[PDB]
Write a protein that binds this ligand. Structure first.
Ligand SMILES: *C(=O)[C@@H](NC(=O)[C@H]1[C@@H](C)ON[C@H]1c1c(Cl)cccc1Cl)[C@@H]1N[C@@H](C(O)O)C(C)(C)S1
Length: 416
């Protein structure tokens, strides 16, 4: 029966139709994808060979459309349409910034969790699914070691528990023994004794590991969970949960590394942290939003075949991960990263951008570049989360450059 019932459309917030059904002279309907290639992973597909993904999958009941003994009357009833929170201009900006690279970008509204752009690369067209890495959604369904981008969580926790302050000094030596193994700063750089805001801006592992060990495993895990770890984020799309160990299984050395964003644990529970890019955006959004974590969403509203609004998504909080005072301090620390530390590549003349960078080593001596951030600093209206994957190219600092560029172009779009 269901080939004769028209499937609803998938449309961006600014009115660009990305999926559509057209009636045949046969009476059946064929699925068409205008601007084929835009937001492919988000729009998704239903394919015997390739599976299901994206909105075609997650909103399938709504688009399908819930007397039936007559196939001739099946036409008389239409699926309802879905208007996404994705803006086509911001989507194009994120897609352009990934050309030539593997990785992904999420742009989100920090006060609501609305997903404004969501891009993964390499990508595909729907036309390609009619023949025989591209199908993986690297924003929500790939896990990465977050590296130093996770120090945002460590810092937040340290401040929120009143165990440290941005002006508290730490020894930040090139190497240090912790829990019977070694932690080293990048390039074994000895930074001497410096305030935490500077250790964070310059991304010292030896300093941040000492904070992680002061916090303890229970605290670190609990705060990661409060930011969304362990939750399949997304009101209306699938995200694979970001992972932390069972804190009871962690060692001190493991803890030290985890607090710098490197999963090195060996135990029954997973090693962590392992993050999605979406989870990283949710962390930046919580910090930008006074500590309030939002469950992100990608559907704005549902429309009936006649264009009436049938329902509207409501923003929903997953709780307050840290206090407002803590969030303000973390924002300030993040401003330092971009103004005077490892995130200077994200600077954009005439707008204050804040963020945190990371770099993580993976298999075969490859490494990935991360960035989370928000803008403008005072009254944030956008959050970005990026991963640029190395795969045998050095991409040091690329996440930050991509991040700043996307924030700046997205701010301009907002201004129009
Ligand atoms: C965080 O990303 C931290 N990264 C590193 O030190 C990385 C790279 C350079 O190699 N392996 C790493 C690692 C170590 Cl040695 C220790 C703990 C965690 C990791 Cl992922 C610093 N942050 C980055 C920047 O991108 O923020 C630097 C390259 C400045 S070093």
């Amino acid at each position: 029966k269901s080939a004769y019932v028209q499937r609803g459309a998938i449309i961006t917030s600014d009115g660009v139709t990305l999926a559509e059904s057209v009636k045949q002279d046969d009476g059946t309907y064929v699925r068409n994808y205008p601007h084929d290639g835009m937001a492919s992973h988000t729009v998704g597909y239903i394919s015997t060979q390739y599976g299901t993904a994206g909105i075609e999958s997650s909103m399938n009941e709504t688009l399908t459309g819930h007397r039936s003994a007559l196939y001739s009357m099946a036409g008389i009833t239409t699926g309802s349409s879905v208007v996404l929170t994705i803006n086509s201009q911001m989507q194009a900006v994120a897609e352009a910034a990934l050309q030539g690279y593997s990785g992904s970008i999420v742009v989100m509204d920090p006060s609501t969790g609305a997903v404004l752009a969501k891009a993964s690369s390499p990508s595909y067209t729907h036309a390609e699914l009619g023949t025989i890495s591209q199908l993986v959604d690297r924003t929500t369904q790939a896990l990465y070691s977050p590296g130093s981008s996770f120090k945002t969580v460590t810092l937040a926790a340290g401040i929120d528990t009143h165990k440290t302050t941005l002006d508290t000094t730490y020894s930040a030596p090139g190497t240090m023994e912790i829990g019977g193994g070694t932690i080293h700063n990048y390039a074994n750089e000895d930074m001497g004794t410096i305030p935490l805001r500077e250790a964070f801006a310059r991304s010292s592992n030896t300093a941040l590991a000492q904070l992680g060990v002061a916090l303890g495993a229970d605290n670190l895990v609990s705060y990661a969970r409060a930011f969304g770890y362990g939750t399949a984020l997304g009101q209306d799309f699938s995200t694979t949960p970001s992972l932390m160990p069972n804190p009871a299984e962690m060692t001190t050395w493991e803890l030290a590394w985890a607090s710098c964003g490197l999963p090195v644990g060996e135990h029954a529970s997973p090693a962590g942290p392992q993050t999605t890019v979406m989870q990283n955006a949710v962390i930046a959004a919580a910090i930008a939003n006074g500590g309030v974590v939002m469950n992100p969403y990608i559907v704005d509203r549902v429309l009936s075949p006649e264009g009436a609004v049938v329902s509207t998504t409501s923003p929903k909080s997953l709780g307050q991960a840290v206090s407002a005072d803590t969030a303000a301090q973390v924002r300030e620390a993040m401003l330092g990263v971009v103004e005077s530390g490892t995130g200077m590549g994200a600077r954009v003349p005439g707008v204050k951008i804040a963020g945190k960078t990371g770099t993580a080593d993976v298999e075969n001596g490859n490494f990935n570049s991360f960035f989370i951030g928000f803008a403008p600093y005072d009254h944030p209206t956008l959050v970005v989360s990026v991963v640029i994957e190395g795969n045998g190219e050095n991409v040091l600092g690329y996440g930050a450059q991509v991040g700043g560029r996307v924030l700046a172009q997205c701010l301009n779009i907002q201004a129009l």
